[PDB]
Amino acid sequence: APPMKDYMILSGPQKTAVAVLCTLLGLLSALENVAVLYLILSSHQLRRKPSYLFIGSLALADFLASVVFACSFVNFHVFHGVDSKAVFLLKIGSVTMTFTASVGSLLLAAIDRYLCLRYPPSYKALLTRGRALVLLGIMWVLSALVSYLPLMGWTCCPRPCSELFPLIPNDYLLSWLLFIAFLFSGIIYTYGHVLWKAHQHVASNIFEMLRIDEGLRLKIYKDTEGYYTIGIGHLLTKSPSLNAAKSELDKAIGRNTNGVITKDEAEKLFNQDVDAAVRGILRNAKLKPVYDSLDAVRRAALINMVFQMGETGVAGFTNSLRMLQQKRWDEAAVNLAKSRWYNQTPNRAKRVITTFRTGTWDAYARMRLDVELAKTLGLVLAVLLICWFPVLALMAHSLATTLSDQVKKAFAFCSMLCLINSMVNPVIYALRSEEIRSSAHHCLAHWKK
Template sequence: MGSPQAPPARSASERRRKPSYIFISSLALADILASIIFVCSFVNFHVFNETDFSKEMYLLQLGGVNTSFSASLSSLLLTAVDRYISISRPSEYKLLMTKKRAWIALGVLWVTCATIASLPLLGWNCCTLNSTCSELFPFVDDNYLSSWICFIMVLLGCIVYAYTHVLWRAHQHVAYMEKHQVQVGKQNTRMRMDVMLAKTLVMVLTVLVLCWSPVLILMIYSIFAKLSNHLRKVFAFCSTLCLLNSMVNPIIYALRSKELYSSLRMVFSRFRKQLKASEESPEAESTHKSSMIETVCEDMRVT
């Protein structure tokens, strides 16, 4: 309590509880889930051609991938809205974007994404409806695939619009400061931090679009035309880019965000100290015991 390092640590923990970092944590969780489920389902089916699975198991795995990817995009959208409010209405930000509202928004987000992803398992599939099945995903109805692609495209469009507005407002702010030579204060410092976070998430969005665009394009193409075996192999390769996207995102967070980078360093340093302490404790006990034995022997000699 009396340590001079306590206030900075406490302020850092408070910053990490801001809605921005709550949304980033949701984004990281979705990326981790996407990586795990993707390795267990998509790679096994498209790369190793393992077809020994039930319809329910396959649709469950596919629903997990769709949930995590949709939640990742939706978390980016919530972060974009958070940055939009922070830069466009900074004086009302703390009133509009509270931690309670952030957690409620995340809850609605994950429930909505899980519900949409579970529709094929709940009955919207080509086996139940006797409709046309997708060429890329067994048991998946083409109409559901079209609806899911439209949902993803709407999310991407909203994210791109929000971040474009954020960067435009940030550019206006920087130009105004340079023109009038405004003295840098606390408000301007916070603005620079918001712009830095916005640029970081733009990098995340750029990597996401580059990795997922080939997959989405092939999905759209499969609805209107028959895919050849070569295109199926191309889709399998492009699917691995989606896994790469989930692996790259945490690296971008750590390199671009000083607070997240310092937090990771603190975690690793504490872990190393605990390891050193656990290694040194047996040696200290043995040294203490040997010193006690020597003392007893000396006492016996004296007597």
């Protein structure tokens, strides 16, 4: 067995550079993750959701790693940690376990999203707060079984020893890398289908946009003012009679409907309504030059305002209408927010204003906080695969050919990428997830007062 002093590679002032770097990154990583743990455990809305308990497990795995990895690195490489066989095996085992549980935590987070977006009503019956905690229990245990295997007697006694890690053999190293490669393929396969479904949820039409705002109904209904209406906001009559509304319906369709229409018949009526909206805008002196400047997505947002308050009402935002034409999306957003339209109907106005600001369909989606979480996980997975790749690629090269002293020096500094990855994650979750964003605002109220 080769002594631990042979792996202790450092060259004077270059060791003091890692001593300040590893300490500062390790302190920042631990403080960023412990905030994410507090925020989830403190907020009533988060702790009860099985989706946020998997995120919490990633924050725990990253926090335990940050502390173990930095204290074991600065002790081994900088201060020269003369550790005995038993003490060293549990240290290397603790490092492996806290890292394996992160990959595991991600895999469960990716299957949680697939079941939610693929089978929506069956998810509440399947994933429960208790059932999630049990599933998180099996994972942490399996992680400890795989990682603590050299401590059980799988060390390099007659078998060839590894280049980078003391006491661990190449047959174990190859087995752990192959296991991690299979977990990554499993995450990729699921996230491949997750994207496909998450995409089918967001609107890509005016019909799909106005379905969220007006509400598609195939039987006669009453609006906020009380008028008899059908389909996607199609007005039947201005009188209080149902028979008058029924007669107007049979004339509009061309057959005896009896108060019930087909989806294809509802879309045919909607296409006649859109044509009349656009022809109206063209014959309005104020609305015509604005419709001409706006793009296809933004035009659908102005048609939406016409369906809600008519042509005479939309022409009343003289200062906003000019800001929109001049392509000053930011100055018009604040100008339209100070309107009574925003005061009366906040949700409809907020969704319309954001479309005029971004030029996307992103505000219009069924289960949008569930779709946006699937969008956040994808960015977390991408950063993981970027940061771990050079570290993993060197370990695979470690099995193929004998490594030089200078290459071993590169790996010590290279492994610092595992510490930046853990620092990038709590910034993404605090900037993209709205539920983590609002939980931090409600917690600061109790901290200050």
